[PDB]
Scaffold this active site. Structure first.
Site, short mmCIF file in Angstrom:
data_model
loop_
_atom_site.label_atom_id
_atom_site.label_comp_id
_atom_site.label_asym_id
_atom_site.label_seq_id
_atom_site.Cartn_x
_atom_site.Cartn_y
_atom_site.Cartn_z
N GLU A 48 0.67 -0.95 0.32
CA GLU A 48 -0.34 0.29 -0.49
C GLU A 48 1.47 1.33 0.08
O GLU A 48 0.19 2.47 -0.38
CB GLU A 48 -0.67 -0.05 1.18
CG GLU A 48 -1.91 -0.87 0.76
CD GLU A 48 -3.07 -0.38 0.08
OE1 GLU A 48 -3.31 1.12 0.37
OE2 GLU A 48 -3.04 -1.09 -1.21
N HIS A 67 -17.44 -9.33 -10.81
CA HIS A 67 -16.83 -8.67 -11.88
C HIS A 67 -17.81 -8.53 -13.28
O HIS A 67 -18.21 -8.14 -13.89
CB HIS A 67 -15.89 -8.64 -12.46
CG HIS A 67 -14.04 -8.71 -11.22
ND1 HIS A 67 -13.76 -7.97 -11.03
CD2 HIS A 67 -14.13 -9.77 -10.86
CE1 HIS A 67 -13.33 -8.26 -9.93
NE2 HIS A 67 -12.94 -9.26 -9.37
#
Ligand SMILES: *[C@@H]1O[C@H](CO)[C@@H](O[C@@H]2O[C@H](CO)[C@@H](O)[C@H](O)[C@H]2NC(C)=O)[C@H](O)[C@H]1NC(C)=O
Ligand SMILES: *[C@@H]1O[C@H](CO)[C@@H](O[C@@H]2O[C@H](CO)[C@@H](O)[C@H](O)[C@H]2NC(C)=O)[C@H](O)[C@H]1NC(C)=O
Ligand SMILES: *[C@@H]1O[C@H](CO)[C@@H](O[C@@H]2O[C@H](CO)[C@@H](O)[C@H](O)[C@H]2NC(C)=O)[C@H](O)[C@H]1NC(C)=O
Ligand SMILES: *[C@@H]1O[C@H](CO)[C@@H](O[C@@H]2O[C@H](CO)[C@@H](O)[C@H](O)[C@H]2NC(C)=O)[C@H](O)[C@H]1NC(C)=O
Ligand SMILES: *[C@@H]1O[C@H](CO)[C@@H](O[C@@H]2O[C@H](CO)[C@@H](O)[C@H](O)[C@H]2NC(C)=O)[C@H](O)[C@H]1NC(C)=O
Ligand SMILES: *[C@@H]1O[C@H](CO)[C@@H](O)[C@H](O)[C@H]1NC(C)=O
Lengths: 98, 595
Positions: free
Chosen positions: B355, B485
């Site tokens: 991150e 998705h």
């Protein structure tokens, strides 16, 4: 919430002469079409405002600036640095400046 | 004229940066402290950003697009002039948003009830994902696989057929041939003297790179099949496909839950530094401060020092309702915050490096204009985050950062245990990703009519992936739409290209750091020349074509699969010796019901 009282000019016909100042507020005209004092495409208000906020990364926070400019016209004199003084040694061949 | 477009964008670039800021600042206060007086605080502040952008979008078509010469001001104009929706009739535009909301709430609130007790009912995320990831019962995994597709996926079949027609109308009004060509417009590059890329060229480069992974995937498919016959005897053929309900999750996307059945040497512990973190009293702050010392080791800037107060590195000392999900925020105005709820584990020691990699990518292109502050394509942003995590998980890096006995011995048996756990996630997902986007591309252009959707779907599973269904499915099912998705309108080719860019970046940085051994032992700490190779891409943004961004790191203009195979050659050598008495490949004729 943003301090919207600090503006800057972002459109002008021509760059400033040094130390020149321009507080007018005429509607800028980018394109060839005349503006007639109303906004629209290619007719922009010329002032924008920094919206400053306390959670802004550095380089986005307000800096205050002071520019000192010493000038020397052709007068007889004026302001200058201060003057230092020492002690007076009485009784002894000395090198003095009064 | 072109100089009027430059003056248009500079008024845009200073009204947008402020309106995007407080529309993203209000989304921070909802995400870290949930009330409903914050959800209403972010819905009106979110809609002022969206209503402003359609007003400037309809002002952008006053300027023509082919009367422009500068490449940068052309790139900003095309990203703003994009009509997207709104090209439809206003009653067809509200029909499309009704379908997208109905398909999204079926996936999140659909329940499956037990036939022995119809009063107990499971959702997908708590309870149905735990069966598919933990059970070893053949009959319970077969129940959870079939009942999710027959009770939820059958509701999405009449909704997905109307979704294809309305999305093809929106794409053909924007001068594409179908909606699949609309998704491939991210990789398009137009007229920059030798770096061009067509939207149909992406289809050949995916299929050309895939036929070099098929030797490696066949030996991984044969080894997992031989290990699954000991876990499920009398259920698996030694020359056939694998059954679709025994792969570790609901769709077989990742094979990462098959590690306890397929571990090469189970008497060697895979290296885990979590106990050495709680023996040295490492707080919440040490995990990021060692992460910041990794990035300053390579020649990248420090954190911005607003990063340390504004961020929320743990869930608070209050029992505070705040979506706990690792993420990296780029609110604007040079204000970067990380939101995660970190626990003292080597797992969150690694995702801290992941991150932070999104932040260092974000801090680099912050000097471009506003409409070019993304990754160069959709795949670069996650790929730069995962080469920070690969370099920090090596035992060479762990023993120099103080976490491994200076008397540690890495044996060749533990490198096989580590590489096989990587290949179940990396290599095991590549034929799933390639098959799914190939099916969706052929549905949009009309090569598959609607009476053969589920016929062509399961023929492509047996041929490309090597996976057979346990129960036959006619044209009342819609098995692609039972994935997140597909029913939530997302593109899926970004997961294929990110895997290929990730090892192209890592192999190009380890030649600059002067590595000597295998590629999977590499670490880019203490270098400066590798970081200078990385920083020359990070600062581009979208201002250059992405093919021009790749030559600044790799030295090529296209994605390449040879760095991915060099990472797995110690596994590919060991796999070819374990399959001397096995059969490599599969038959598309065998079925678990056809006897
Ligand atoms: C979540 O944030 C909101 C606003 O940031 C807090 O609600 C009020 O915030 C004002 C500050 O403008 C305080 O004067 C009030 O006292 C706050 N309300 C209450 C009921 O305390 C809210 O407190 C935050 N959530 C929590 C759990 O503290
Ligand atoms: C149009 O293209 C030119 C170069 O092709 C850009 O010119 C550069 O502009 C920056 C600041 O605007 C200067 O610091 C550079 O020295 C310029 N380069 C050259 C070679 O003169 C120009 O920025 C582009 N237009 C826009 C709006 O970005
Ligand atoms: C965007 O959609 C419009 C239709 O709503 C397309 O047609 C444009 O219509 C507007 C008037 O509403 C004209 O000002 C434009 O000249 C038309 N298009 C142009 C610029 O030729 C328009 O073609 C679409 N734009 C895109 C991105 O193709
Ligand atoms: C790890 O290295 C050892 C040391 O070479 C390997 O052991 C050798 O294995 C080969 C093939 O079975 C034998 O011919 C040699 O005689 C072994 N060496 C010794 C000293 O006995 C071992 O196979 C390697 N393991 C892996 C998984 O690669
Ligand atoms: C890589 O960087 C680390 C961090 O600066 C270096 O670690 C230092 O190593 C020396 C001797 O090995 C110790 O005396 C220092 O205390 C270490 N520093 C820290 C902050 O722990 C390491 O030496 C570097 N590697 C190389 C090859 O130079
Ligand atoms: C980064 O911060 C450390 C202290 O936190 C400082 O010693 C170091 O010099 C900084 N890096 C640069 C390039 O100034």
């Amino acid at each position: 919430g943003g301090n919207y009282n600090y503006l800057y000019r972002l459109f002008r016909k021509s760059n400033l002469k040094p130390f020149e100042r321009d507080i007018s507020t005429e509607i800028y005209q980018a394109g060839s079409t005349p503006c007639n004092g109303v906004e629209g495409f290619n007719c922009y208000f010329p002032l924008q405002s920094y919206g400053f906020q306390p959670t802004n990364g550095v380089g986005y926070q307000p800096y205050r600036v002071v520019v000192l400019s010493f000038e020397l016209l052709h007068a007889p004199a004026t302001v200058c640095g201060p003057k230092k003084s020492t002690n007076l040694v009485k009784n002894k061949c000395v090198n003095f400046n009064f | 004229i072109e100089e009027q477009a430059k003056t248009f964008l500079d008024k845009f670039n200073h009204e947008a940066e402020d309106l995007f800021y407080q529309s993203s600042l209000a989304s921070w206060n909802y995400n870290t402290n949930i009330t409903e007086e914050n959800v209403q605080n972010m819905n009106n502040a979110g809609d002022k950003w969206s209503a402003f952008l359609k007003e400037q979008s309809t002002l952008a078509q006053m300027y023509p697009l082919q009367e422009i010469q500068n490449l940068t001001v052309k790139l900003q104009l095309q990203a703003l002039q994009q009509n997207g929706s709104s090209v439809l009739s206003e009653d067809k535009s509200k029909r499309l948003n009704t379908i997208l909301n109905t398909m999204s709430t079926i996936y999140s609130t659909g329940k499956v009830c037990n036939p022995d007790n119809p009063q107990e009912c499971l959702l997908l995320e708590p309870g149905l994902n735990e069966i598919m990831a933990n059970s070893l019962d053949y009959n319970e995994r077969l129940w959870a696989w079939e009942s999710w597709r027959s009770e939820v996926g059958k509701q999405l079949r009449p909704l997905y057929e109307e979704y294809v027609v309305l999305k093809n109308e929106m794409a053909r009004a924007n001068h594409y041939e179908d909606y699949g060509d609309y998704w491939r417009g991210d990789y398009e590059v137009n007229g920059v003297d030798g770096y061009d890329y067509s939207r149909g060229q992406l289809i050949e480069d995916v299929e050309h790179t895939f036929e070099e992974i098929k030797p490696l995937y066949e030996h991984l498919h044969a080894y997992v099949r031989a290990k699954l016959m000991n876990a499920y005897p009398s259920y698996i053929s030694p020359i056939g496909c694998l059954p679709a309900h025994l792969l570790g999750d609901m769709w077989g996307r990742f094979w990462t839950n098959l590690y306890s059945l397929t571990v090469p040497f189970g008497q060697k512990p895979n290296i885990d530094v979590t106990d050495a973190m709680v023996d040295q009293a490492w707080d919440a702050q040490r995990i990021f401060k060692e992460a910041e010392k990794f990035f300053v080791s390579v020649g990248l800037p420090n954190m911005t020092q607003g990063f340390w107060e504004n961020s929320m590195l743990t869930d608070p000392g209050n029992v505070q309702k705040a979506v706990c999900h690792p993420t990296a925020w780029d609110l604007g105005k040079g204000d970067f915050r990380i939101l995660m709820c970190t626990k003292v584990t080597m797992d969150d020691f690694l995702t801290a490096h992941h991150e932070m990699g999104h932040i260092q990518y974000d801090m680099a292109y912050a000097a471009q204009p506003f409409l070019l502050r993304n990754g160069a394509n959709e795949g670069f942003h996650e790929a730069v985050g995962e080469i920070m995590s690969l370099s920090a998980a090596t035992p060479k890096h762990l023993k120099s950062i103080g976490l491994l006995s200076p008397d540690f011995q890495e044996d060749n048996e533990t490198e096989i245990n580590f590489l096989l756990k990587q290949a179940l996630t990396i290599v095991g997902t590549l034929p799933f990703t390639y098959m799914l986007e190939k099916w969706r591309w052929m549905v949009f252009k009309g090569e598959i009519p609607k009476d053969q959707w589920m016929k062509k779907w399961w023929e492509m599973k047996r041929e490309i992936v090597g996976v057979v269904e346990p129960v036959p499915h006619d044209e009342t099912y819609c098995d692609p739409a039972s994935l997140f998705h597909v029913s939530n309108d997302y593109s899926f080719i970004r997961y294929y290209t990110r895997t290929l860019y990730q090892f192209q970046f890592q192999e190009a940085l380890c030649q600059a750091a002067k590595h000597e051994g295998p590629l999977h032992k590499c670490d880019i700490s203490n270098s400066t020349e590798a970081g200078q190779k990385l920083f020359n891409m990070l600062r581009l943004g979208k201002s250059e074509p992405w093919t021009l961004a790749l030559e600044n790191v790799v030295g090529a203009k296209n994605m390449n699969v040879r760095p991915l195979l060099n990472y797995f050659e110690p596994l590919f050598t060991w796999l070819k010796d374990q399959n001397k008495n096995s059969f490599v490949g599969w038959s598309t004729d065998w079925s678990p019901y056809a006897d």
